[PDB]
Design a protein around this motif. Structure first.
Motif, PDB file in Angstrom:
ATOM      1  N   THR A 181      -6.625   3.947   7.681  1.00  0.00           N
ATOM      2  CA  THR A 181      -7.227   2.637   7.476  1.00  0.00           C
ATOM      3  C   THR A 181      -6.154   1.697   6.936  1.00  0.00           C
ATOM      4  N   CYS A 182      -5.474   2.124   5.874  1.00  0.00           N
ATOM      5  CA  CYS A 182      -4.418   1.327   5.250  1.00  0.00           C
ATOM      6  C   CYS A 182      -3.223   1.123   6.182  1.00  0.00           C
TER       7      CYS A 182
ATOM      8  N   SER B  24       0.806  -1.215   0.000  1.00  0.00           N
ATOM      9  CA  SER B  24       0.000   0.000   0.000  1.00  0.00           C
ATOM     10  C   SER B  24       0.844   1.272   0.000  1.00  0.00           C
ATOM     11  N   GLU B  25       0.805   1.963  -1.132  1.00  0.00           N
ATOM     12  CA  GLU B  25       1.556   3.189  -1.343  1.00  0.00           C
ATOM     13  C   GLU B  25       1.142   4.345  -0.433  1.00  0.00           C
ATOM     14  N   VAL B  26      -0.157   4.498  -0.204  1.00  0.00           N
ATOM     15  CA  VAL B  26      -0.632   5.594   0.623  1.00  0.00           C
ATOM     16  C   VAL B  26      -0.313   5.389   2.111  1.00  0.00           C
TER      17      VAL B  26
ATOM     18  N   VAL C 205      -9.282  11.809   3.284  1.00  0.00           N
ATOM     19  CA  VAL C 205      -8.138  11.086   2.739  1.00  0.00           C
ATOM     20  C   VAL C 205      -7.279  10.602   3.911  1.00  0.00           C
ATOM     21  N   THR C 206      -7.127  11.451   4.924  1.00  0.00           N
ATOM     22  CA  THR C 206      -6.354  11.095   6.102  1.00  0.00           C
ATOM     23  C   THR C 206      -6.977   9.873   6.788  1.00  0.00           C
TER      24      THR C 206
ATOM     25  N   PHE D   5       1.507  15.039   6.133  1.00  0.00           N
ATOM     26  CA  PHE D   5       0.592  14.421   5.164  1.00  0.00           C
ATOM     27  C   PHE D   5      -0.639  15.309   4.908  1.00  0.00           C
ATOM     28  N   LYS D   6      -1.284  15.736   5.986  1.00  0.00           N
ATOM     29  CA  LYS D   6      -2.481  16.576   5.906  1.00  0.00           C
ATOM     30  C   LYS D   6      -2.214  17.906   5.236  1.00  0.00           C
TER      31      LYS D   6
END
Ligand SMILES: CN(C)c1cccc2c(S(=O)(=O)N[C@@H](CC(N)=O)C(=O)O)cccc12
Ligand SMILES: CN(C)c1cccc2c(S(=O)(=O)N[C@@H](CC(N)=O)C(=O)O)cccc12
Ligand SMILES: CCCCCCCCCCCCCC(=O)O
Ligand SMILES: CCCCCCCCCCCCCC(=O)O
Ligand SMILES: CCCCCCCCCCCCCC(=O)O
Ligand SMILES: CCCCCCCCCCCCCC(=O)O
Ligand SMILES: CCCCCCCCCCCCCC(=O)O
Ligand SMILES: CCCCCCCCCCCCCC(=O)O
Length: 582
Positions: free
Chosen positions: A50-51, A3-5, A44-45, A17-18
């Motif tokens: 989650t990931c 998972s890239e994200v 998105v955050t 990130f935010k």
């Protein structure tokens, strides 16, 4: 990994990130409101977390471009607000991303950003540090679509540090203002240098850019091997192409790959890279791109050996022309951190021209034997200008230096509008107060960077409102010949004087209550108009009128009943000066 994200989130940290997601969305959806973007960020955050918890959770394996696009296409008001851009969503990746890039408006029609009052900024900063900063981050990013996001974040943190330090100070404005103006300029400069490099890569081609990079990189890493600097120039060229194309994600990856490379081989590139290579993922890259020049090796031969004396010059040149010229540049650049990049490029072009003529003659070595003697006048030219101009700036201060540039350039290009001449000469003046403070060894590079930004700012303006062919020539000419072209401008002997306008030289008492800045520019505006009315006046004549005017003002502003004075004495000054200037 899978998972890239989740990987980007762990690397970046939630805070960074935010901020980055906010900037990224603001650069594409330039017209959506702040509150709408803040929701996209939170969503998105939450998704990223989650990931982070479960690498194999739904959608977590999808690429960053796809995830970003899907969210973009989520905006329901997309078509009513951006119209044609909405049709991008019907396309499939990677064609969808390409489609978004083609709609990034490098110049939206939003109001100018105004600076609120110090007390309002500080009180707002105190009552809610985060929205205050994120709101402005948003306002700046949407107005500057191509500004590299991570760099836009570094500025945000400096800004934060200026509000923390000043909103506590006794005299807030005295601490904050000059910091805001300094951060603004620095932001204006980075912006200009960025679009400048891209414009060059687009117009003048890859070669011209690789040439600029070899020179700049060799001054910075003089100890590096030429085979290492070529590797770096190649990767750096790819980075800029993609970064100029406007694709943030692609740009970011190439920059990260490159920064780790330099660090893993830092021991064979530069010694100044230790600091940079420790710093966080987001700062390595920025630190390395600005890193001070390394000390150059002490045991270095004389260029003349391999490039003039050797007899195999042409054999080695015809074997791989660009490479040979590359080694020349690398060799000349690394022994001269004190030269500006475009100077080095001018020498390399002079050398190329010479070899092209000479290597096709009976006896090569005789034809190109006295080439280093042809460089002399190319090098002395910019150095002499630095000496002459910085000395002048020492005698007169910044303001009077600015007025001298005013008379000088109004006379060369009388056609430019007065407000443009005043703005240009002012910034030229500040390049003087900034670079002259440096030692002779670091002046040329300094001037080059700040001059470059003042020049295209000037060209852009003239691009819209053409008025002179000579300006347009300098503006479209090679980017290496740009400054010499402007320096070569001669006094305009063709110009016909502006017919006298009484209103232009009538001054009211309001000039006394005005602020220093607004006061200097009111006087400087009158100065350009004077020269445009009497372009034949001499430094002595004008100097006399300025000394008179100077008095005039001072007197009428310390005397009872201002308005009268300015109207009584005003007629006298104007009447007398007209006679003096015949
Ligand atoms: C650090 N970086 C990102 C900047 C901070 C604050 C203001 C900045 C500006 S600006 O908004 O003050 N000035 C811009 C546009 C404007 N609204 O006046 C200009 O004169 O070209 C331009 C570029 C970068 C800036
Ligand atoms: C860290 N990696 C990825 C780099 C990115 C961008 C520019 C870099 C440069 S540079 O010499 O082009 N540095 C630029 C600063 C900039 N515009 O980023 C300059 O001085 O004009 C050198 C080494 C590494 C660079
Ligand atoms: C770089 C993003 C950080 C945002 C913080 C900026 C807050 C200051 C607002 C003032 C901007 C008005 C422009 C100016 O300085 O004239
Ligand atoms: C790998 C080596 C690539 C560099 C090639 C060296 C060529 C130097 C000539 C200078 C060209 C000036 C470009 C320009 O017109 O701006
Ligand atoms: C779906 C949104 C994805 C978030 C986009 C941010 C990714 C940027 C990666 C940062 C890498 C830093 C590179 C550098 O050093 O310049
Ligand atoms: C303002 C100070 C004047 C600067 C003098 C010009 C020197 C420019 C050197 C860059 C170049 O090589 O063109
Ligand atoms: C409008 C006037 C043109 C601007 C001239 C800037 C060039 C500065 C180089 C210094 C010089 O040689 O005069
Ligand atoms: C035709 C006669 C008009 C006379 C008006 C004089 C205007 C020139 C004054 C410029 C200001 C001098 C600079 C200064 O005082 O610092």
């Amino acid at each position: 990994h899978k998972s890239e994200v989740a990987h980007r989130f762990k690397d970046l940290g939630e805070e960074n990130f935010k901020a980055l997601v906010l900037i990224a969305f603001a650069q594409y959806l330039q017209q959506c409101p702040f509150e709408d973007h803040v929701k996209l960020v939170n969503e998105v955050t939450e998704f990223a977390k989650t990931c982070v918890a479960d690498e194999s959770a739904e959608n977590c394996d999808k690429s960053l471009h796809t995830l970003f696009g899907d969210k973009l296409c989520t905006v329901a008001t997309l078509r009513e607000t951006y119209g044609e851009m909405a049709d991008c969503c019907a396309k499939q990746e990677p064609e969808r991303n390409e489609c978004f890039l083609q709609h990034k408006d490098d110049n939206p029609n939003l109001p100018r950003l105004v600076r609120p009052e110090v007390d309002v900024m500080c009180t707002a900063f105190h009552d809610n540090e985060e929205t205050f900063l994120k709101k402005y981050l948003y306002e700046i990013a949407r107005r500057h679509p191509y500004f590299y996001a991570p760099e836009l974040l570094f500025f945000a943190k400096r800004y934060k540090a200026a509000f923390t330090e000043c909103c506590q100070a006794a005299d807030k404005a005295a601490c904050l203002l000059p910091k805001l103006d300094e951060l603004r300029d620095e932001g204006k400069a980075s912006s200009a240098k960025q679009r400048l490099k891209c414009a060059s890569l687009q117009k003048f081609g890859e070669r011209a850019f690789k040439a600029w990079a070899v020179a700049r990189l060799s001054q910075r890493f003089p100890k590096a091997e030429f085979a290492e600097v070529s590797k770096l120039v190649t990767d750096l060229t790819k980075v800029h192409t993609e970064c100029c194309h406007g694709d943030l994600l692609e740009c970011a990856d190439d920059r990260a790959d490159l920064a780790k490379y330099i660090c893993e081989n830092q021991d064979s590139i530069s010694s100044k890279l230790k600091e940079c290579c420790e710093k966080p993922l987001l700062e390595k890259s920025h630190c390395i791109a600005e890193v001070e020049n390394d000390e150059m090796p002490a045991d270095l031969p004389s260029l003349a050996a391999d490039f003039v004396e050797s007899k195999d010059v042409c054999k080695n040149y015809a074997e791989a022309k660009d490479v040979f010229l590359g080694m020349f540049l690398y060799e000349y650049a690394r022994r001269h951190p004190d030269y500006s990049v475009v100077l080095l490029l001018r020498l390399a072009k002079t050398y190329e021209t010479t070899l092209e003529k000479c290597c096709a003659a009976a006896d090569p070595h005789e034809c190109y034997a006295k080439v280093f003697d042809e460089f002399k006048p190319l090098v002395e030219e910019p150095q002499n200008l630095i000496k002459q101009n910085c000395e002048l700036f020492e005698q007169l201060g910044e303001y009077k230096f600015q007025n001298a540039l005013l008379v000088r350039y109004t006379k060369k290009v009388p056609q430019v509008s007065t407000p443009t001449l005043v703005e240009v000469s002012r910034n030229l003046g500040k390049v003087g107060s900034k670079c002259c403070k440096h030692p002779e060894a670091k002046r040329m590079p300094c001037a080059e960077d700040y001059l470059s930004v003042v020049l295209n700012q000037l060209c852009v303006l003239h691009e819209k409102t053409p008025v002179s062919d000579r300006v347009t020539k300098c503006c479209t000419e090679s980017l290496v010949n740009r400054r010499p072209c402007f320096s070569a401008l001669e006094v305009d002997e063709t110009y016909v004087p502006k017919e006298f306008n009484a209103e232009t030289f009538t001054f009211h008492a309001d000039i006394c209550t005005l602020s220093e800045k607004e006061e200097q520019i009111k006087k400087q505006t009158a100065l350009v108009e004077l020269v445009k009315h009497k372009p034949k006046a001499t430094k002595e004549q004008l100097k006399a009128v300025m000394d008179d005017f100077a008095a005039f003002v001072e007197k009428c502003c310390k005397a009872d009943d201002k308005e009268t004075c300015f109207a009584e004495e005003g007629k006298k000054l104007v009447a007398a000066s007209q006679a003096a200037l015949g």
